[PDB]
Amino acid sequence: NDKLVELSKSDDNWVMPGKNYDSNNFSDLKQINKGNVKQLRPAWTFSTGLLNGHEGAPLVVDGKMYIHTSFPNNTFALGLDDPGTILWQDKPKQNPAARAVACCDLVNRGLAYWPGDGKTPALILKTQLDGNVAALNAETGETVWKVENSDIKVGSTLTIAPYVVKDKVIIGSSGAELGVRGYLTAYDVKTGEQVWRAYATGPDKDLLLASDFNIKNPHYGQKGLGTGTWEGDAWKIGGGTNWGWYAYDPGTNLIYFGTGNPAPWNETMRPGDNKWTMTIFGRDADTGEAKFGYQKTPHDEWDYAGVNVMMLSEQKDKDGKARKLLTHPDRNGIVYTLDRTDGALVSANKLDDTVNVFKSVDLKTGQPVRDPEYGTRMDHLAKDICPSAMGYHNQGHDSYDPKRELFFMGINHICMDWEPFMLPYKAGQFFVGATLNMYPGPKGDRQNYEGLGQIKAYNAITGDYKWEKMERFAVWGGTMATAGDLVFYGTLDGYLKARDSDTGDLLWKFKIPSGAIGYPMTYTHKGTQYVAIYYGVGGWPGVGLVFDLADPTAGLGAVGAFKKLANYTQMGGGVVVFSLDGKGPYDDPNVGEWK
Amino acid sequence: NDKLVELSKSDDNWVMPGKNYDSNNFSDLKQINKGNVKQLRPAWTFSTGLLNGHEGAPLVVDGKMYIHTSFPNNTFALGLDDPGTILWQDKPKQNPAARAVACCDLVNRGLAYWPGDGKTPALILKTQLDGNVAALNAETGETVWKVENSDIKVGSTLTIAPYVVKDKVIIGSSGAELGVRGYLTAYDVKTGEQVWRAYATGPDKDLLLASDFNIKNPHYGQKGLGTGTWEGDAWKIGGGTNWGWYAYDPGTNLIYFGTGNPAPWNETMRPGDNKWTMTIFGRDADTGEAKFGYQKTPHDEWDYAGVNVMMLSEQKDKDGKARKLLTHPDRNGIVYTLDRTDGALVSANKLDDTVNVFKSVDLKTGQPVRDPEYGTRMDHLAKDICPSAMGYHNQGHDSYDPKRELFFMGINHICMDWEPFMLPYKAGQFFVGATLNMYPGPKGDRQNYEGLGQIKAYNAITGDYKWEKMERFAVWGGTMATAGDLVFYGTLDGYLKARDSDTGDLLWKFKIPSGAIGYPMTYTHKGTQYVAIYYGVGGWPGVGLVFDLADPTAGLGAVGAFKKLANYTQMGGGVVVFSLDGKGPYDDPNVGEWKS
Amino acid sequence: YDGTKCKAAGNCWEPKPGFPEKIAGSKYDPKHDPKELNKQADSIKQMEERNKKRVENFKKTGKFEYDVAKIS
Amino acid sequence: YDGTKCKAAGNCWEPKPGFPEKIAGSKYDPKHDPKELNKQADSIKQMEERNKKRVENFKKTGKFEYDVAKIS
Ligand SMILES: O=C(O)c1cc(C(=O)O)c2c(n1)C(=O)C(=O)c1cc(C(=O)O)[nH]c1-2
Ligand SMILES: O=C(O)c1cc(C(=O)O)c2c(n1)C(=O)C(=O)c1cc(C(=O)O)[nH]c1-2
Ligand SMILES: [Ca+2]
Ligand SMILES: [Ca+2]
């Protein structure tokens, strides 16, 4: 959308998930900087009325903030000159049974915005856990249209944020732990009409492939593999749901994103490479046809779901040629850089030297070289595999500084033991089939159960890490960077933090009410710069605390790894907004009073 | 308790509900003052993990903060040099049926502290909605003793804070809306053994009267009236629960407190003055025996439950003589001042000139003079009564500045329509019997449902108000005052606010996450002054938001009165802590981080 | 009824115009069941007995037990 | 099985030592019910047909209706 490109150029706005179509989470503002950040303090706050995990970040457009919640998925609009008055609210009615088929807490990753065309007014776009998609009038909150995407009666839910491109809205999928076959969908943003739908497994007609799919890289695979790398009809319940993030390039007209894990977790019940689960895709925005597809993890044995963040850039390669690029840190312990015009592989390096599941990734063949001592199989208990199923990276949205050519990544340090078991498939019931034990990696404290996270600065062409720092818990929610020489991020023990962009030195922190699992955002209003973040712990690391669990193998193995989290935080739900010296809308305290 | 008196003299501590045994909520600290309050901003925060209303305030003793919640009544201990680490937690297991017999949200008014002696360690004292009372080790959180006070199967619950006096802990009661006959109890703080128990209605043996009860004011009434002002056995289900606040004077050995409303709300079903409901009491701390009792509202017709805050002072009266006093703002629209040594009446003035239920209170006979045009009765719809059943004052804990001789009071501006109806008594079921409509009083905006609160500064001897200011919603949670020429208070629309003590001018406010229904507190730590307040809206004003209700007569009539509250706030639960320029424990951000 | 006519100390109640001095036998009679009136005092007697058994066991043995079924 | 032996482009899977090339008839056979496998595709067809009724009525009338029983 050309009008969204123009609105994103103003520092008074934050108009889409990831700030801009490159998805870099980067601001040119420098009012707040490494020389004055000690003066940063709260300006105003807002509670959402709900508990459980609060993921994503707010939107800001035309002098207003738009806020979203955990289940039952409420929406609020606030005016920035008087945020104590709620302009409008949307409160959906949903079947309480949706809660029982959610794998990993009652979370939602956020809102999108479409600017209007003179006939249809500007719109806010949202998902619901029960599988409905809705368009709301941005000025009044009234429902313009609503449609069914996903069915809870077969185990299928929604947690992903919508994404707007041209006059279309893109919607993903959840439920591989219940045997759901993945698909993504494009709708007409004005009416709700279905324009195209593409599946992750099965016959080529259902995959929606271009006539020249992978013509630059035929060794990645081409026709017939969505059924040829499976035995019989096991692809019908085969996984590959997409629940993470997108990027977009108007010059190629492609959206970029990853597909998730195959089902069940028991590898012995599904022989074959299981395509096109675990795959980096480039698809045309108007027809959905795939130009390229690269499978990162053939025949998954570990639950390394391939859904993580996409970040675009333009850099010289090692031979000195200018390249248009995408960069992508995966659950499996590898960070991938590809040419975004044709799919060619440029670099594939370890997130940390303790990864042992693969020896390396071969850049000429594209296959990961497996170490068989760290595989899984029936009738065998596998021990000390790194990464764990929680990954060395999960759902957090990271950032990129274009002048420094550095990526700022929030990382996990968690390893595991694993054994599978045989089980039947019944639609509507869980279909996992493995038992796990999880604990800190070799650079943490495996007997006190602390040292479970890292934050690092990275160059994608040389592969060098500029700096690396340990954290008490996994850095789950992502990062945001600015031209004031600062990197901002939230933590599970309940802080907003800032580090120096060149060295990693800790410069500032504030104790917020509950742990953070979303990313920070920034904007100006009447000349003043503000920084905002959600609070409210949850998601996979919080299941022990949220559901009052004690067996370490419960929560798919997450309860044992995070047993100390309850000693540092409790549940919550809301937003905290910061500025220099805490300057804000009530500096005249008579504004917003009764008279 | 002699060591609690000594501990209350340090500005590093806040050791009991109401700060000190005078219950004045007043600090000698002046680092924060009218000249620099514009610089006040948050230093740190903490979420409790629960929704519903958050009443009362935290305690601070020996470098630690102690925090309490809504149902199921959890307790947390934090160290002030590193509040990110939770030192210990207590999480009770209770029957979920306790929720169904609470009248007025799942609230609790707070903790008390006993400093230890020579073999028993220091203790944290707490109540639970299901009717149990427990003592916890203050250093480790482990349970020392637990006893049953109240039974949910007959509609009886607990929401009041405990109060420590000498080596005893005093416990109140809740449930007049379900026909519970009120009582208060003293236990041995070391073991849980029951020492004395006094009832609000019934035969004199159950009331525990001293042999000289009311000898200075015998016209208030003396023996036989706990059965003599009722018909037959109606006193057995007659109300008078005590769920508010206390004060204490070591020089008289008396605790001071008020008893609640008679049951049912239908006045026609209980002819007589209904003693000793609606009464100001002075009771001996060691034996429980009453020295005096003044009934403010004989034969209640309006649910003016008599439980509100008690504030002590010493001032010269209109003839120039020095007196020891108590001052008490009631639900019924009158603020009372009595001699606290013998019970004599000194003054009884209206909280606002729009009060119409009484013409005046006669100081020589002791009776309120009723206006029959604003009474209630069967087969009649009464209109435009001020105050409403919510009161011109409810459970908020107010403050007193002893240099200025002024009380700072958080007030309600709410009036009503009322009609009663006939119903049976069944143990475990509601026993109310009236339908209500509630709305802003004459000084607010009745058409828009805004202008429901006031804050005022008052002298109890002359009766004059130094200043008066209107507020969007009722000021429900109380006030705190300091030697820095400041008055602090929280509001239902979600602010902490500060006003000038001499003029009332609005000097500062901050947008906290949810509305406030408890009082502010203040303390020093390593040289820095802090101000703390709970957030989390609820209690009676919040029932429409909390339970998703829309019929305006629902919530005992509070749903229609507070129909605009959801346009300004949502639910929450936690504490926000403030200082000058936000200075705090993480100014070096490496403090409290994980290291290898 | 204005509250100012008092036949004895602390006793000033009067019926309103058209209402009776006693409600028994009238259309306002509540007809309460004595067996329901007595339930909350019998409940207090039983709580008090269970609490005495808890407190005497603490003072003999030195160790507190809340669950009466486990006390000797 | 180290992932580097491929019988065709994009098809590199091999069985681990002691395991079979095909699992039908073996002690690892999942034995799936064909009628359970087909339930999620039948559900997607029923959602797509209800959504088409909602969208065509919105474009013709200019008023959105979600309950398809109210659409003639
Ligand atoms: O396979 C799927 O369809 C699916 C869905 C979701 C989700 O919708 O949140 C998660 C997972 N998988 C999962 O593998 C996972 O590690 C996870 C972590 C979280 C979270 O919000 O913290 N969601 C999910
Ligand atoms: O009669 C009783 O025993 C009783 C108990 C309670 C309580 O325990 O919170 C309230 C009430 N009455 C009541 O009359 C009242 O106005 C009220 C307000 C609130 C509050 O917390 O906002 N509690 C109660
Ligand atoms: Ca998954
Ligand atoms: Ca009451």
Query: What domains can you pick out in chain D, each with its CATH number?
Result: 1-72 (4.10.160.10)
Residue among C11, C31, C54 whose CB faces B147 most closely: C54
Structure determination technique employed: X-ray
**DSSP 8-state symbol, A64:** E
Instruction: Check whether A468 is labelled as a binding-site residue.
Output: no
C-beta of residue A374 within 8 angstroms of C-beta of residue A382:
yes
Collapsed DSSP state (helix, strand, coil) of residue A432: coil
Query: How far apart are alpha carbons B58 and B65 in whole angstroms?
Result: 7
Residue given tokens 């004060």 in the structure block: B247
B533: region left, alpha or beta (phi > 0 left; psi from -120 to 50 alpha): beta
Between residues 81 and 100 of chain A, which touch chain B (CB distance below 8 Å)?
Answer: 83-86
Residues A198-221 as b/e (b if ≥16 CB within 10 A, e otherwise) read bbbbbeeebbbbbeebbeebeebb
Determine if ligand 2 sits within 6 Å of the CB of residue B395: yes
Domains of chain B: 1-596 (2.140.10.10)
Could you tell me how many residues make up chain B?
Answer: 596
Resolution of the entry in angstroms: 1.2
Could you tell me how many residues make up chain A?
Answer: 595
| Count of CB pairs separated by less than 8 Å, A with B | 119
Residue A160's nearest CA partner among A348, A332, A2, A308 is A308
Which residues in chain B have Cβ-Cβ distances shorter than 8 Å to A511?
44-46, 83-84, 586
Please indicate if any CB of chain B lies within 8 Å of the CB of C5: no
Which residues in chain C have Cβ-Cβ distances shorter than 8 Å to B425?
30, 32-33, 36-37
Query: How far apart are alpha carbons B549 and B108 in whole angstroms?
Result: 22
C-beta of residue A224 within 8 angstroms of C-beta of residue A205:
no
Q: Cα dist. A285→A253, A310, A313, B369 in Å? A: 6, 16, 20, 81
Concatenating the DSSP letter of every residue in A158-223 gives --SPPEEETTEEEE--B-GGGTPPPEEEEEETTT--EEEEEESSS-HHHHTB-TTTTSS-GGG--T
Residue of the nearest CA to atom 24 in ligand 1? A104
C-beta of residue A548 within 8 angstroms of C-beta of residue A533:
no
Residue B267's nearest CA partner among B289, B294, B295, B234 is B234
- Closest Cα of chain B to A441: distance in Å? 13
Concatenating the DSSP letter of every residue in B248-273 gives EETTTTEEEEE----S-S-GGGS-S-
Residue B134 makes CB contacts below 8 A (sequence gap 6+) with B92, B125, B126, B128, B143, B145, B146
- Closest Cα of chain B to A3: distance in Å? 32
Q: Which residue is closest to B148 within chain C, CA to CA?
A: C47
Residue of the nearest CA to atom 21 in ligand 2? B539
Structure tokens at A234: 């096991």
Number of neighbouring beta carbons within 10 Å of residue B438: 23
Q: Is A521 exposed, middle or buried (0-12, 13-18, 19+ CB in 10 A)?
A: buried
Please indicate if any CB of chain B lies within 8 Å of the CB of C59: yes
Query: How far apart are alpha carbons B486 and B469 in whole angstroms?
Result: 15
Bridge partners, B135 (sequence order):
B125, B145
Query: How far apart are alpha carbons B430 and B493 in whole angstroms?
Result: 31
H-run or E-run covering D44: helix D39-61
Residue B76's nearest CA partner among B84, B85, B66 is B66
User: Are B84 and A568 an interchain contact pair (Cβ–Cβ within 8 Å)?
Assistant: yes
Residue of the nearest CA to atom 22 in ligand 2? B539
Alpha-carbon Rg for chain D in angstroms:
24
**Which chains share 3+ C-beta pairs under 8 angstroms with B?**
A, C
Which residues in chain A have Cβ-Cβ distances shorter than 8 Å to B590?
506
Please indicate if any CB of chain B lies within 8 Å of the CB of C26: no
D26: region left, alpha or beta (phi > 0 left; psi from -120 to 50 alpha): beta
List the B123-127 sheet strands across, edge first: B112-114, B123-127, B132-137, B143-148
Between residues 536 and 595 of chain B, which touch chain A (CB distance below 8 Å)?
Answer: 566-574, 576, 581-582, 586, 589-590, 593-594
Which residues in chain D have Cβ-Cβ distances shorter than 8 Å to A146?
64, 66
C and B make contact (3+ CB pairs below 8 Å) = yes
Q: Cα dist. D39→A177, A388, B562 in Å? A: 16, 32, 49
List the B486-490 sheet strands across, edge first: B26-27, B480-482, B486-490, B495-500, B506-511
Query: How far apart are alpha carbons A164 and A162 in whole angstroms?
Result: 7
Please indicate if any CB of chain A lies within 8 Å of the CB of B49: yes
Give the nearest ligand 1 atom to A389 CA: 16
Number of neighbouring beta carbons within 10 Å of residue B569: 27
Query: How far apart are alpha carbons B270 and A100 in whole angstroms?
Result: 52
Instruction: Check whether A314 is labelled as a binding-site residue.
Output: no
Between residues 405 and 464 of chain B, which touch chain A (CB distance below 8 Å)?
Answer: 450-451
C-beta of residue B399 within 8 angstroms of C-beta of residue B515:
no
User: Are D54 and A229 an interchain contact pair (Cβ–Cβ within 8 Å)?
Assistant: no
Determine if ligand 2 sits within 6 Å of the CB of residue B539: yes
Q: How far is CA B361 from the centre of its chain?
A: 24
**DSSP 8-state symbol, B180:** P
Ligand 1 centroid to A103 CA: how many Å?
Answer: 7
Residue type present at position C28: Y
Please indicate if any CB of chain D lies within 8 Å of the CB of A421: no
Peptide bond before C30: cis, by omega within 30 degrees of 0?
no
| Count of CB pairs separated by less than 8 Å, B with C | 126
| Residue of A105, A130, A303, A330 with catalytic role | A303
C-beta of residue D55 within 8 angstroms of C-beta of residue D49:
no
Which residues in chain C have Cβ-Cβ distances shorter than 8 Å to B378?
28
A26-27 and A480-482 beta bridge pairing:
parallel
Residue B4's nearest CA partner among B167, B133, B121 is B167
Q: Which residues of B are catalytic?
A: 303
Bridge partners, B169 (sequence order):
B164, B187
Query: How far apart are alpha carbons A302 and A46 in whole angstroms?
Result: 40
Q: Cα dist. A337→A23, A349, B324, B351, C19 in Å? A: 15, 9, 81, 73, 91
User: Are D30 and A425 an interchain contact pair (Cβ–Cβ within 8 Å)?
Assistant: yes
Residue B89: HSE in the Cβ half-sphere, 13 Å Cα cutoff: 15
Determine if ligand 2 sits within 6 Å of the CB of residue B440: no
Ligand 1 centroid to A177 CA: how many Å?
Answer: 9
Which residues in chain B have Cβ-Cβ distances shorter than 8 Å to C16?
372, 375, 377
